[PDB]
């Protein structure tokens with residue numbers, strides 16, 4: 005995440021930090037390489053919007 | 058139960074373990090043998106389903122039937138589409154909404170990203186396969202065409218190995234009493250013509266000459282075993298008579314035993330084993346109980362001494378109807394030779410025996426001849442090729458040849474018999490009353506010294522017909538010695554094989570004289586000998602006469618020129634009844 | 642008398658010929674006994690002087706120097722390769738009881754023929770050996786029942802590589818010897834094991850007739866009601882005029898394995 | 903599903919839960935739980951386990 009900035013900043017919203025940490029937990033525990041894992045800045049917002057509405 | 062695996066696994070459900078343990082308790086306390094008891098994998102599921110669908114208050118019998126059929130079609134289309142985990146959308150697509158309170162549908166919900174979804178699933182893949190089979194058996198967006206034949210060929214190739222179990226459970230359900238019980242449980246009549254369709258499929262598979270694409274002989278045995286219907290099994294197994302099966306598990310042993318016992322039209326059987334006596338005990342017991350058998354191929358099987366003892370014990374049964382038994386490369390020895398001699402002396406049905414590549418030894422042959430010389434010994438043909446024997450047992454061999462009234466053909470090649478052993482055999486075979494007809498010393502290391510004794514045997518005994526001496530470097534002297542006897546009118550030989558005999562061009566005149574005089578022999582094979590173009594030309598010159606009563610000549614491995622090849626072809630076409638095989 | 646000094650492993654004095662196992666047109670094989678070691682091996686001798694053009698024998702020795710390193714459970718063991726008595730001397734493993742050439746003749750005596758199970762069990766090992774040697778770019782020059790040996794334990798040992806027994810489609814219209822020539826020879830060997838006889842037997846023993854028979858690829862199909870459909874079609878694929886029509890060694894090995902299972 | 907169907911006979915030991923401390927708090931100084939939910943397939947032992955307790 006710290007590599008990506010548009011996310012590091014908006015990671016102050018605790019819900020939007022959880023939405024990004026659970027996303028990485030899924031890859032971590034689903035037998036996948038996070039070193040090659042991707043975290044696009046739009047999936048976080050889609051999940052945030054969905055959780056809010 | 059532990060023998061069966063599809064049950065050991067699903068035995069974790071305590072109710073499905075009780076349903077299988079009470080089933081065995083009934084047989085145990087109803088005066089029956091569990092060692093022969095059967096526990097088909099479909100009866101357990103039928104009882105499980107019946108116990109689960111208990112009417113929870115009289116209500117919606119038609120509703121229960123409709124929801125069971127909807128769940129059943131769900132299982133069917135899931136099995137067709139490899140849909141292990143269903144979804145609410147699919148459950149709605151199929152006639153379903155609620156009601157069915159996860160009897161065989163456990164709502165395991167998986168959370169991904171931010172929210173979790175339903176992802177309905179079946180209690181187990183085998184359960185879903187059973188429900189697909191029930192969908193097929195039972196009687197009526199569109200789920201897979203109810204063509205039983207279509208499902209059948211899909212199980213028959215097309216990389217649908219995930220249909221053996223659905224077919225097995227269809228066979229378990231098409232059972233008459235089981236089908237009636239399910240009908241009484243669910244208030245819905247069943248179709249029995251599916252049973253006749255399956256029978257016709259089995260008829261096609263049997264009239265396919267061991268087509269074994271997928272629905273092989275073992276698979277059909279398992280299907281019929283799960284069917285457990287005696288009359289259906291009898292009516293279906295009649296097309297099997299030529300059967301080739303191999304075993305790797307106790308379940309395979311049981312299926313083969315039951316299928317063979319139900320088989321009434323079985324003649325030729327080949328049996329293989331992987332990885333014994335405990336299950337083989339019952340297997341061979343059922344074989345012996347069988348009364349229509351003719352052949353038993355146990356070759357390429359590591360039976361061992363205990364296995365051979367069990368086999369001979371089974372064969373000793375008075376009802377044994379086994380006529381031929383081939384035991385090639387079965388790891389047999391002298392110890393089992395004792396029981397083999399006992400079998401030969403006791404049973405009066407045995408006709409022939411081949412024990413190639415058996416570590417019989419001198420002691421083994423000593424034990425064997427004891428049975429052979431018994432008055433009840435009715436064996437005719439014996440093959441002991443590559444038995445590691447030597448001339449030491451040749452004394453007993455000659456004694457048995459001169460004693461037995463039925464032993465006619467003996468082939469003991471690939472043994473260090475030697476010239477002394479050949480002479481010992483000849484001293485007894487010379488007896489005119491001796492019944493030996495075809496003699497084979499395949500690669501027996503024979504020299505010209507025994508050639509004179511063999512010629513004396515040919516002149517004295519009048520029952521010898523065929524002589525194979527491949528692998529013996531007789532030489533021209535031995536060729537002439539043999540010819541001196543075979544030219545005798547008393548000689549009654551018909552076929553002479555002398556390949557790998559180390560024969561030079563000198564024996565050419567011997568063979569020309571034999572061709573011009575001999576009036577009994579019909580076939581002469583002499584390949585792997587450099588007789589020469591001169592020899593072939595002289596032989597063809599003698600053959601072009603109408604006086605050549607012989608019909609077959611074999612010069613394979615002989616290399617000649619274009620002229621010699623053309624002459625050979627001309628001779629063969631001038632005498633169509635006289636064939637010369639000299640292909641490249 | 643004075644036998645040759647028994648110093649090295651390459652000398653006739655170090656071998657005692659018990660008997661002559663066979664005598665082919667190209668080589669003579671005897672059951673020798675290594676005096677220095679004390680084991681029964683097979684001593685094969687070829688008269689190099691006859692067909693010795695000096696451009697083939699040297700390369701033959703150089704290549705056969707590689708062969709002892711060929712260590713496979715299903716390939717004959719190459720012990721020695723030297724020159725003595727004005728002819729070659731090759732020391733190999735001896736398998737007398739196991740010889741498909743004699744096995745076919747013995748089985749032809751009985752009306753019943755060999756079983757699909759046994760042929761598959763032998764063919765899987767044959768394919769394993771062929772693939773193992775091909776993956777190292779080494780090929781079996783001639784594959785025939787007389788040069789395929791088995792053992793009591795049930796293992797199949799490939800004999801020493803040599804008109805041949807099997808005429809390759811590439812041999813006909815001679816252009817070379819491809820990896821698919823070995824596939825053709827193996828398919829013909831399967832047919833020979835199946836029918837006790839090669840797929841090109843007939844009364845017309847003339848070279849032109851048999852060559853056109855090979856070209857047209859016409860043979861009496863194996864008994865359907867005793868041999869399997871997949872096997873009868875695998876032999877057909879392996880026996881094809883087109884080089885690439887023959888399935889690759891790995892392909893045939895994989896199918897053989899899945900059938901032996 | 904698939905493996906247990908095949909044999910699921912491989913050695914796969916696990917850490918078992920006991921029954922007397924089913925209501926004890928997760929840690930050692932937290933609060934004890936006030937609800938447990940046994941869940942299993944149909945006819946797998948729920949009622950017999952309740953009777954046993």
Ligand SMILES: Nc1ncnc2c1ncn2[C@@H]1O[C@H](COP(=O)(O)OP(=O)(O)OP(O)(O)=S)[C@@H](O)[C@H]1O
Pocket residue numbers: 071072075943944945946947948949950951
């Ligand atoms: N602990 C156990 N040990 C052995 N057998 C058991 C045990 N528990 C249950 N069984 C057997 O399983 C059967 C039913 O078990 P239950 O768990 O009561 O089924 P159930 O789950 O109550 O049925 P449902 O799902 O509530 S409709 C009993 O009749 C027992 O024979």
Ligand SMILES: [Mg+2]
Pocket residue numbers: 947948949950
């Ligand atoms: Mg309960």
